Structure 1
Amino acid sequence: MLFEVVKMGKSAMQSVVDDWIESYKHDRDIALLDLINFFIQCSGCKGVVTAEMFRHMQNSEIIRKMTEEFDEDSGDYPLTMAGPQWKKFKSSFCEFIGVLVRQCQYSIIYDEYMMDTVISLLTGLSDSQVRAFRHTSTLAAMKLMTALVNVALNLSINMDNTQRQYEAERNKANERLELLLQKRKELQENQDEIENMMNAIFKGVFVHRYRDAIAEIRAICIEEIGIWMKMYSDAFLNDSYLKYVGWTMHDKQGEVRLKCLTALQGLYYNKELNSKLELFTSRFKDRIVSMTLDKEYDVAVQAIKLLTLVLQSSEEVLTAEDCENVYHLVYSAHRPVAVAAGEFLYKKLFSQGPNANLVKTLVFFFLESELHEHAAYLVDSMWDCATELLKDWECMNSLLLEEPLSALTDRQESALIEIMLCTIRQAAECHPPVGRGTGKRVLTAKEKKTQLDDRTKITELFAVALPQLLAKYSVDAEKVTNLLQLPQYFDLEIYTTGRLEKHLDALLRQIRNIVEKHTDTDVLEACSKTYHALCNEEFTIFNRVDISRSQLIDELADKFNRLLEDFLQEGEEPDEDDAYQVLSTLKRITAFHNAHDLSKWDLFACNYKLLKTGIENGDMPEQIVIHALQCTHYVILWQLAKISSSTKEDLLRLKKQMRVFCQICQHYLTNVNTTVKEQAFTILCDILMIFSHQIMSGGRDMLEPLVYTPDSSLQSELLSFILDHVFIEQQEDEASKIEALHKRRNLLAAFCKLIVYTVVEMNTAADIFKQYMKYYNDYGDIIKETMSKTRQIDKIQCAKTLILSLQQLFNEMIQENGYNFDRSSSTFSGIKELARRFALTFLKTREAIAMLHKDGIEFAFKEPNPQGEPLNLAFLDILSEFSSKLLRQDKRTVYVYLEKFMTFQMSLVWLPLMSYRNSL
């Protein structure tokens, strides 16, 4: 009756032990027998122990019997089972044993008959090959041992208090201290009986299952040895105990390496005169430092967190390379490691203003550890540590403007701005950067106030100071780009509120100053997105900026036009620097057309005239054509944005533009320039999407006249680009190739945008499906995404392209082998494995698999042997992999369609055909 009480019992634990000890006091044996059966039944053992057993049967014999009458139904025991109604068990079971000892702590755990019995039974189960017995009994044995330590701790105290009772009675009758020294002796004996039991469980259980084979039983025993060393630190914080943690730090299971660090953490947060720890650190410091890159990350966090507790305790033990290694972790991808890395950095290196010293330190640190070209992740690593320092924007602002008191280098300047922007962004939008934040965590009501407070503090402070900074560093393009991001996070309501309109004028006059001076494509993209942020309909200054906006583009178009009439003349041959001129103002326009309605300038003429030259004479700078196609593309999308009240005529005029531009990019996609095809192909795959069947998919039935569908020519010219420039054979380390792949992936994404979406015929997707097991890492994720969406469009015609991919990897073989090739070579075996992975795409998956065989069979004989008894027979040990998923009724269905070509003589060099039929 006791077992179910601990499982389904919401009754208090001390009540169960006391009602149990009442049964013990009444008759010891009937109480012990159910305490044993409690343990036997805590392991899930559905057997029972009798009275004749406990009278005569030995402990090894009783464990043997309970394994016979175990009567299990599965391999699960309680401690393995899942659900909260079982972790209430792990807790109730542990609290039962600790409470049991502590209540017996006085006068019963000394009868030398009960504790003796339990340990002997627990020490026995703790050696059974039966995992449920060893696991249960070992958890018990350890919880019982902690109890004994607690009991042993009270014997220590109570014995010190008597020694104080004694000497006071010596300094102040003798029969009162002779009554005391016998008390002291009785306590001495009681400690010896307790020490024995601890030894009987340590040497009996711990020294064996600490290195058990089951990982869950090693994590049990390290957690408890960490508790002993913590709670009776005087008696148990030796090396003869710490060793069993220093070794287990090397265990190959993660759950264990954690339960060592967290146990060791208990020993340093106390930080109460650690002196034995000084030796244990000496030997294992190198391992703990290594663990900050443990393969399991929970361990890595606790390894870092532990090293901070080692820093506070001594600071003398960590060399230089050790600390420097932990610093680099602030750039890690796992945020928990990063934030705890930066806790170790702040604690180690941070202790014109008070923070002026600190901000220089951060800057220098960011510059010294060249792992990151930018501070976005550096800032998030320490957003939790030093939040009042990262938001002291006055301190950074003065350090960039206020000249020295008693300097600063161009590199530290171009670093302090980077750190300043990142803090500003993470302040304004209250979430960490990509690859660090867990999800779209909703903002706390306290956080929304902390978010709107500094958002204004940023807008108020920098609206004045931003134009000054943009005036002192106007020349370094790398700097201004960072400094033309600050408006994105402004609260534009505060420019009108409070005499500040003067400062926006100083800003706009400073912005158009740098766009007159720079040509860098990244500066103008930020100038453009600035103007697009300040031209907002909600706010009180749309007008004051739209002036400068249209006022600036006037100065642009007036130039650009004049530059064309001289650059596109028949007589004069323009030159290198005359081309620099047209490119500069072209870039200046292109980047503005992307974020600003500039159809009010109708730039289609000058670009259409420019493009016509480049394809005609074939001698135009790549950067002009690239920026031409762009600027063009941006005029067609802007006109299309304004279309019924809007003049219902000029519709076909926009189609002529779209139609002739599509023909322009067709001749430019064929160019020898690699970059020029990239932008031509990109604009095509985006154009063909917009002017497509879907332009009226939802509403807008009126925008139906605009009708484009790609040529059979423009389709094969687009796919041939995917083959030559995305599926290549397999500059600056790994930071560049990932940039390259992420470009090549964006391209294969834009073409597979067309396939799913019926912009091109689906049979094109066969030259891409055949690569699914070749470029699984590189482009695999896109293939199995385009392939599974095509199956959900046309279930059957997919099977007709899946095989076309297999058909095209078959003549891809013979093209550079010959028809006599080995039909088992790892080359063939892969196509055979590609078939197995293809048939697993299959509910309506019946009419498709039929026509797939038919297109496979009708191809396997599609050419007869010009000399012999055939050709393409091998394609059937490939196709055999599809017959598994075929229906039991189609064994018939397709075999006669097979017998449409297999004669009676063939079913009499031919292995491929005999395996195909053998699948039916």
Structure 2
Amino acid sequence: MLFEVVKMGKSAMQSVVDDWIESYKHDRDIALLDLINFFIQCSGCKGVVTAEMFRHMQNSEIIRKMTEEFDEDSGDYPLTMAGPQWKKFKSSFCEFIGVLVRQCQYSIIYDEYMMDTVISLLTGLSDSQVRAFRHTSTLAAMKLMTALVNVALNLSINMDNTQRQYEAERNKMNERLELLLQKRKELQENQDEIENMMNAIFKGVFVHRYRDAIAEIRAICIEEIGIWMKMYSDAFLNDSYLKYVGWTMHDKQGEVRLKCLTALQGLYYNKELNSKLELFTSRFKDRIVSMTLDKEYDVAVQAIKLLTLVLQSSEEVLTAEDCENVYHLVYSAHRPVAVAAGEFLYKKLFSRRRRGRQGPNANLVKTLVFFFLESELHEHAAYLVDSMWDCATELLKDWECMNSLLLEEPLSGEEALTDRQESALIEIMLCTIRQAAECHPPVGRGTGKRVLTAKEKKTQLDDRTKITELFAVALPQLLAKYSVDAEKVTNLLQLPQYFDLEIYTTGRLEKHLDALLRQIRNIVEKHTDTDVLEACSKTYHALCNEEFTIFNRVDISRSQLIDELADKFNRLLEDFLQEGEEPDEDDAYQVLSTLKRITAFHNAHDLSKWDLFACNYKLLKTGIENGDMPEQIVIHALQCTHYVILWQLAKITESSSTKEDLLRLKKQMRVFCQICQHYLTNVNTTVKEQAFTILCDILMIFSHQIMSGGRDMLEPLVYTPDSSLQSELLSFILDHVFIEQASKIEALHKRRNLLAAFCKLIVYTVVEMNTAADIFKQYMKYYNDYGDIIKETMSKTRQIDKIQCAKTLILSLQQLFNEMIQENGYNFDRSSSTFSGIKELARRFALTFGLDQLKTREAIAMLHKDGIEFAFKEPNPQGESHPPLNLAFLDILSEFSSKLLRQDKRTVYVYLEKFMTFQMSLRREDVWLPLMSYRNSLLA
């Protein structure tokens, strides 16, 4: 059968078609019945059109009879069926239609029988209410017209060629004219016949199916209209056909919108077809710019792509305001749309388009700096660079021009760059260098875990080599020029991390290393900004790599720097801490400055040869004895002592360490914890926060986990926290994290960090799990802010001990009920928001026990037994008959009554009987209703 052969996909369609054409020539009715049965069977209909039906019945009655005989196992029709066999079927169906027209193009198509029969059947099935028939019949008619457009295009080519010959004949002047004139007449009858067939499909199927309820049928029609106007633009690119695309651009479904954009991009690839699309662009330019910010990002990508195509053909159509909206898409969170916007920006301000400031890309670098400054959406250039990376690689990787704009002097006639423009260029250069050296996009703009290809690795190596050679000489010069500016110095000091250090010894550029080291030493001795000092310390660590031969030189420089800093600290402290006298603000400024620098270098560098614990302990001890020590000195002294104790623990790993070292470390760590506990009660909030962070960290490092992993020599160094410290740490969290509901978003991140620290101590069994009750009770009230941290803590604790977590959860709900009865009092309404909110946390907590219902039997049973005793605890002072105080609490417990397995249900009621008399079993709404609910929850 025809359908079966097309589905099998074994024979060539031309053989299938030629076989049928041979059969049609023998008897036409037999062949047309088979062609008709094909379209009906390609919809899934297992019925047959008998010759008697075709000869006597009408198309409408046949479709009715076929609907009744459509055996159906699923609502899936061939074109909906998923699978590779069915993907082959779609292309096989479309190809059969094309081949049939191609083969019957010169003779059968003009017989007034076949095409009319096919178009009539297709139009009838395109009006059917069965999606199977309509979808299939629409696809067939749409493909038939694409094929008929081809015959019209071929007929037009022949008539133009024939007409050209007729002009020549009359010019040269004949039976030649007569025979040529007959060709013209014959081709006109043929062209008229094809146009009539095409209008029948357009006015019978397309006019109605472009508005079909099902989006799939609408997209089929939109796709085909694009093909026709691209194929035969001289008869299909008028506004009477383009009007349909404009209306469908406003479609609710994005699949259909994507097809409209793709159809219009096909027309803009040819620049000749411009005069026709000009009026349409003018009317719908607004909608296309609006589709850039589309809910579906895929449609957005195509809209920016189509605007880029419009920019190429005609630039005046888009006004600056419209272009500005697209420029704002460079800083988008979706890389695909940002990359598409980068291409539009490249083709609008950069693509349009000697060494140094005179270099060819100098103007384009200045143009990019001007754009970043005129767009106050972002303060860093990371996303602008990532978006324009695949398009402006030459400009972005031209670091000689960028370095010449920052170091070389302005040419006569060139206006200088302002400090803001120079700061902008340094941000752009650092960003280009980072993406070149580390071939990964910024956060949010990629997975960041792609295996690099061979070319990617070769590109990375050549980029790093070029970066190292150029900035090995330039970085010293740049730091000397912008040393006073903290923002500029911070950015510039990050460059050495992206360098091939071996280039210094393979390239004899060691004199440049000496200069880089001097400027870092110079900046440290002049700046007090924490970020400048963090950069200097981290740059030194990168340079201090024992895998590179340059290590000896950089170790000498680091040692010389710490020698000077430590010497000054010791001589300043001897006079600052002198018993008596008064502390000049000058002395404290000098002390804070030197402590700040040492704390920075102590985080990444050892510095243990310069014993600093004694100095830091004296400063902190004086604050506890006097009380007037500047807050900032206290913060830096606490941080520095943390690093002193941490660097000593790293050296003890070597068995070469004696018991004196372990015993000295224990005494030093124990003294520090007491100093931190004192500042946790300080009046300055910053000092309280610093002490908490350092204490939480030191308690994790010096915990029982220091003995795990075969490190049993560190058993003497384990520090267990006392109940006093545990209570003080909880007080800080309940006062500085759960407070009364730009700086807001920053304070959120700081408070989230502080909460994570305490939660880490609970999940690593450093502090008791009963302390988590306060955090657990604040789940719902602070869900938008700390919910993730609390949920992680609850999950982690459930793995440590489900039974203990169950008890911790009940205490939190027990605590919130106590607070309501402290305000609303015992006589409170059971419809109040506070009770209702408390009832809501119970529902959420119940949801977290569902996992492993057969493994959480003991935890849920404990919850009930723990809460039953809280409800029946304080007896009614009025009388031993009036309901018990807090009896209302069991209304909160009723929520967990579902998780109890039926066998566990019976046992918990037995526990209830012990706290309930048969007299207590009296029916009243007088607070006796609460208990009735919990009893009824467990009874069924």
Give me the TM-score of the superposition, normalised by structure 1. 0.95
Quote the offset at 1:546 in angstroms.
0.6
Quote the offset at 1:65 in angstroms.
4.1
Quote the offset at 1:795 in angstroms.
2.4
Structure-1 separation of matches of 2:62 and 2:831: 59
Quote the offset at 1:556 in angstroms.
0.2
**Pair 1:739–1:111, CA change in 2 (3 A):** farther
Q: How does 1:322-401 map to 2 (within 5 A)?
A: 322-351=322-351, 352-401=358-407
Percent of pairs identical after alignment? Answer: 100
Structure 1 stretch displaced more, 523-532 or 430-439: 430-439
Q: Does the Cα contact within 8 Å between 2:441 and 2:448 map onto a contact in 1?
A: no
Quote the offset at 1:4 in angstroms.
4.1
Structure-1 separation of matches of 2:264 and 2:618: 75
Q: Does the Cα contact within 8 Å between 2:807 and 2:862 map onto a contact in 1?
A: yes
The question of 1:293 aligning with 2:293 is answered yes
Quote the offset at 1:89 in angstroms.
3.1
Measured against aligned partners, the alpha-carbon deviations of 1:137-173 in whole angstroms (never above 9, x if no partner) come to 3233322222222222222222222222322232339
Quote the offset at 1:549 in angstroms.
0.2
Give the match for residue 893 of structure 1: 907
Structure-2 separation of matches of 1:393 and 1:847: 67
Could you say what secondary structure the match of 1:49 adopts?
coil
Structure 1 stretch displaced more, 870-879 or 554-563: 870-879
Structure 1 stretch displaced more, 811-820 or 394-403: 811-820
**Pair 1:868–1:403, CA change in 2 (3 A):** same
Structure-1 separation of matches of 2:52 and 2:772: 78
Q: Does the Cα contact within 8 Å between 2:9 and 2:88 map onto a contact in 1?
A: no
Quote the offset at 1:586 in angstroms.
0.9
Quote the offset at 1:655 in angstroms.
1.5
Structure-1 separation of matches of 2:816 and 2:133: 58
Structure-2 separation of matches of 1:873 and 1:49: 79
Quote the offset at 1:694 in angstroms.
1.5
Q: Does the Cα contact within 8 Å between 2:342 and 2:387 map onto a contact in 1?
A: yes
Structure 1: runs of 5+ lacking an equivalent: none
Quote the offset at 1:10 in angstroms.
4.7
Measured against aligned partners, the alpha-carbon deviations of 1:649-707 in whole angstroms (never above 9, x if no partner) come to 32122122211211222121222222222222111221121111222332312222211
**Pair 1:776–1:119, CA change in 2 (3 A):** farther
**Pair 1:133–1:838, CA change in 2 (3 A):** farther
**Pair 1:559–1:277, CA change in 2 (3 A):** same
Quote the offset at 1:494 in angstroms.
1.0
Could you say what secondary structure the match of 2:128 adopts?
coil
Structure-2 separation of matches of 1:527 and 1:401: 22
**Pair 1:174–1:837, CA change in 2 (3 A):** farther
Structure-2 separation of matches of 1:196 and 1:340: 43
Structure-1 separation of matches of 2:10 and 2:933: 65
Quote the offset at 1:918 in angstroms.
3.3
The question of 1:405 aligning with 2:416 is answered no
Structure 1 stretch displaced more, 604-613 or 742-751: 742-751
Structure-1 separation of matches of 2:832 and 2:223: 54
Give the match for residue 355 of structure 2: none
Quote the offset at 1:560 in angstroms.
0.5
Structure-2 separation of matches of 1:871 and 1:246: 72
Could you say what secondary structure the match of 1:650 adopts?
helix
Quote the offset at 1:604 in angstroms.
0.8
Structure-2 separation of matches of 1:907 and 1:65: 72
Quote the offset at 1:68 in angstroms.
3.9
Structure 1 stretch displaced more, 666-675 or 596-605: 666-675
Structure 1 stretch displaced more, 495-504 or 206-215: 206-215
Structure 2: runs of 5+ lacking an equivalent: 352-357
Structure 1 stretch displaced more, 51-60 or 342-351: 51-60
Quote the offset at 1:380 in angstroms.
1.0
Structure-1 separation of matches of 2:845 and 2:107: 75
Structure 1 stretch displaced more, 694-703 or 680-689: 694-703
Quote the offset at 1:483 in angstroms.
0.9
**Pair 1:271–1:906, CA change in 2 (3 A):** farther
Give the match for residue 15 of structure 2: 15
**Pair 1:467–1:242, CA change in 2 (3 A):** same
Structure 1 stretch displaced more, 422-431 or 342-351: 342-351
Give the match for residue 692 of structure 1: 703
Quote the offset at 1:52 in angstroms.
4.3
Give the match for residue 636 of structure 1: 645
Give the match for residue 886 of structure 2: 872
Structure 1 stretch displaced more, 248-257 or 530-539: 248-257
Quote the offset at 1:421 in angstroms.
0.9
Structure-1 separation of matches of 2:59 and 2:720: 86
Structure-2 separation of matches of 1:412 and 1:229: 49
Quote the offset at 1:508 in angstroms.
0.9
Measured against aligned partners, the alpha-carbon deviations of 1:434-472 in whole angstroms (never above 9, x if no partner) come to 111234111111121111112111111111111111111
**Pair 1:14–1:803, CA change in 2 (3 A):** farther
Quote the offset at 1:779 in angstroms.
2.1
Structure-2 separation of matches of 1:674 and 1:77: 70
Give the match for residue 173 of structure 1: 173
Q: How does 1:471-870 map to 2 (within 5 A)?
A: 471-643=480-652, 644-728=655-739, 735-842=742-849, 843-867=854-878, 870=884
**Pair 1:26–1:565, CA change in 2 (3 A):** farther
Quote the offset at 1:735 in angstroms.
4.2
Structure-2 separation of matches of 1:721 and 1:667: 13
Structure-2 separation of matches of 1:655 and 1:463: 45
Structure-2 separation of matches of 1:245 and 1:127: 22
Counting matched residue pairs gives 915
**Pair 1:479–1:4, CA change in 2 (3 A):** same
Measured against aligned partners, the alpha-carbon deviations of 1:420-439 in whole angstroms (never above 9, x if no partner) come to 11111111111111111234
**Pair 1:87–1:677, CA change in 2 (3 A):** farther
Structure 1 stretch displaced more, 757-766 or 136-145: 136-145
Structure-2 separation of matches of 1:69 and 1:725: 75
Quote the offset at 1:824 in angstroms.
4.1
**Pair 1:349–1:880, CA change in 2 (3 A):** same
**Pair 1:87–1:418, CA change in 2 (3 A):** same
Quote the offset at 1:378 in angstroms.
1.3
Quote the offset at 1:26 in angstroms.
4.0
Structure 1 stretch displaced more, 146-155 or 415-424: 146-155
Q: Does the Cα contact within 8 Å between 2:440 and 2:448 map onto a contact in 1?
A: no
Q: Does the Cα contact within 8 Å between 2:496 and 2:539 map onto a contact in 1?
A: yes
Quote the offset at 1:258 in angstroms.
1.4
Quote the offset at 1:415 in angstroms.
1.4
Quote the offset at 1:75 in angstroms.
3.5
Structure-2 separation of matches of 1:903 and 1:55: 92
Quote the offset at 1:11 in angstroms.
4.0
**Pair 1:454–1:703, CA change in 2 (3 A):** same
Could you say what secondary structure the match of 1:257 adopts?
helix
Give me the TM-score of the superposition, normalised by structure 2. 0.93
Quote the offset at 1:8 in angstroms.
4.1
Structure 1 stretch displaced more, 739-748 or 276-285: 739-748
Quote the offset at 1:526 in angstroms.
0.5
Structure-2 separation of matches of 1:492 and 1:664: 43
Could you say what secondary structure the match of 1:874 adopts?
helix
**Pair 1:824–1:106, CA change in 2 (3 A):** farther
**Pair 1:662–1:83, CA change in 2 (3 A):** farther
**Pair 1:824–1:11, CA change in 2 (3 A):** farther
Structure-2 separation of matches of 1:75 and 1:748: 54
Q: Does the Cα contact within 8 Å between 2:98 and 2:143 map onto a contact in 1?
A: yes
Quote the offset at 1:34 in angstroms.
4.0
**Pair 1:814–1:12, CA change in 2 (3 A):** farther
Measured against aligned partners, the alpha-carbon deviations of 1:467-497 in whole angstroms (never above 9, x if no partner) come to 1111111111111111111110110111112
Quote the offset at 1:585 in angstroms.
0.8
Q: Does the Cα contact within 8 Å between 2:857 and 2:904 map onto a contact in 1?
A: no
Quote the offset at 1:278 in angstroms.
1.2
Structure 1 stretch displaced more, 571-580 or 534-543: 571-580
Structure-1 separation of matches of 2:59 and 2:900: 60
Measured against aligned partners, the alpha-carbon deviations of 1:514-552 in whole angstroms (never above 9, x if no partner) come to 111111111111100111011101101111011110101
Could you say what secondary structure the match of 1:374 adopts?
coil
Structure-1 separation of matches of 2:270 and 2:593: 66
**Pair 1:253–1:677, CA change in 2 (3 A):** farther
Could you say what secondary structure the match of 1:143 adopts?
helix
**Pair 1:180–1:806, CA change in 2 (3 A):** farther
Quote the offset at 1:70 in angstroms.
3.5
Structure 1 stretch displaced more, 324-333 or 669-678: 669-678
Quote the offset at 1:238 in angstroms.
1.3
Give the match for residue 933 of structure 2: 915
Structure-2 separation of matches of 1:820 and 1:64: 74
Could you say what secondary structure the match of 1:918 adopts?
helix
